Structure 1
Amino acid sequence: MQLTPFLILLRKTLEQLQEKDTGNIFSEPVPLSEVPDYLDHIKKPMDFFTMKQNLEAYRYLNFDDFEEDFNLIVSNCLKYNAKDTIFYRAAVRLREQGGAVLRQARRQAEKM
């Protein structure tokens, strides 16, 4: 397939995923200055802003590498936060609502 339409599709998909994060709590890296223990067991932080930087740096050339970093946004949050927190429930909801978005986007990609 051709590169430019694939990237235009990942851009749209990333926008749709960000739309599901209505609190915008995954829009930027977790502020280590406010969460000084975050990197103790989170070995690769991830967020939507960095996903955008990776997209435009041509770091996502297939749907799996894009989806892998989205999954990190979710899994890091589930790992760090207790189950009874807003953070944890937000990651569960993002996993649920993001899953449909990714499935449809991958179908569009496989037609290419």
Structure 2
Amino acid sequence: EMQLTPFLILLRKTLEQLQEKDTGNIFSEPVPLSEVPDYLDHIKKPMDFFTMKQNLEAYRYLNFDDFEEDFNLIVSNCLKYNAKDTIFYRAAVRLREQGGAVLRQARRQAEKM
């Protein structure tokens, strides 16, 4: 029960803030399946920030939960695929931690709409 335009503006800003936390840009684009041929064997739904941007503009995110669900996929897919002693796994933990704070503040602002 809100206006579409300000909500999408908020999701755009939020997505930019989450990308800022991924300083290595390891989640910016889809996991390269040509370099990771076994990736789809374990990961049923790949996700990344570029795909999230396309979904946002395609109106796939009309509430905060669906936006946050795809962010959580970025994190959980990486924790699942990679061993704990890898940079990838630790980067996903760090993104979960730093991204969670970004998301809580942004959801509060959506709730004011």
Instruction: Give TM-score, length-normalised by structure 1.
Output: 1.00
For residue 37 of structure 1, report the CA deviation from its aligned partner. 0.3
Q: Report the Cα distance in structure 2 between the residues aligned to 1:54 and 1:32, rounded to whole angstroms.
A: 20
Q: Say how many residue pairs are matched.
A: 112
**What is the CA deviation profile of residues 60-88 of structure 1, one whole-angstrom value per residue up to 9, with x for unaligned ones?**
00000000000000000000000000000
Identity %: 100
1:66 matched residue in structure 2: 67
Q: Name structure 2 gaps, 5 residues minimum.
A: none
Does the residue aligned with 1:65 lie in a helix, a strand or coil? helix
Does the residue aligned with 1:26 lie in a helix, a strand or coil? coil
**What is the CA deviation profile of residues 25-73 of structure 1, one whole-angstrom value per residue up to 9, with x for unaligned ones?**
0000000000000000100000000000000000000000000000000
Q: Report the Cα distance in structure 2 between the residues aligned to 1:108 and 1:70, rounded to whole angstroms.
A: 18
For residue 23 of structure 1, report the CA deviation from its aligned partner. 0.2
For residue 108 of structure 1, report the CA deviation from its aligned partner. 0.3
For residue 101 of structure 1, report the CA deviation from its aligned partner. 0.1
Q: Report the Cα distance in structure 1 between the residues aligned to 2:11 and 2:71, rounded to whole angstroms.
A: 12
**What is the CA deviation profile of residues 86-110 of structure 1, one whole-angstrom value per residue up to 9, with x for unaligned ones?**
0000000000000000000000000
Instruction: Give TM-score, length-normalised by structure 2.
Output: 0.99
2:111 matched residue in structure 1: 110
Q: Name structure 1 gaps, 5 residues minimum.
A: none
Q: Report the Cα distance in structure 1 between the residues aligned to 2:53 and 2:33, rounded to whole angstroms.
A: 20
